[PDB]
Design a protein around this ligand. Structure first.
Ligand SMILES: [Br-]
Ligand SMILES: [Br-]
Ligand SMILES: [Br-]
Ligand SMILES: [Br-]
Lengths: 96, 92
């Protein structure tokens, strides 16, 4: 349960497997987690694209912020992984 | 549930209320969710700043991207709320 998105999803499934009365509750909760992750990944992609633009234009004044974004995105993938081309969220060295 | 970060957090708490053995489990889960909300808001703020820079430079090429960041930030606040000046996450 080492701080990965997969652990939190797994723990919620486990609970409504032990106690089926929790299923509606905790499934709406997993749905919200999923929506939160989705929205974050949408904005993150937009920010990355904006950073690509700033670099392509040789706009060096904003380079620090563009680096920050890289680090933040890299930190995100450590916790949440990355959805591959087949639409499956994968982690670690299963990414490359 | 109204599909808000707060509604989801409660469902997690409520569950280990009915069933205390779930507590280590679901609270670790809540920890991960909070970390996720935190990391997303850190990046979001940074992105907003980048858009601010681009708007102070009058660069109309990237303006669509800036309007996009604004739209998705407003949507974020719909689900996750927003921390007011007193350190309390509030919704609307
Ligand atoms: Br939270
Ligand atoms: Br962090
Ligand atoms: Br600026
Ligand atoms: Br509120």
């Amino acid at each position: 349960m080492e701080k990965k998105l997969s652990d939190a999803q797994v723990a919620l499934v486990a609970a409504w497997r032990k106690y089926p009365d929790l299923r509606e509750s905790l499934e709406e909760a997993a749905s919200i987690l999923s929506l939160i992750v989705f929205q974050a990944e949408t904005l993150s992609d937009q920010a990355n694209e904006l950073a690509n633009y700033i670099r392509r234009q040789g706009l060096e004044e904003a380079e620090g912020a563009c680096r920050n974004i890289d680090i933040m995105r890299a930190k995100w993938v450590e916790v949440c992984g990355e959805v591959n081309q087949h639409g499956i969220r994968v982690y670690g060295d299963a990414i490359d």
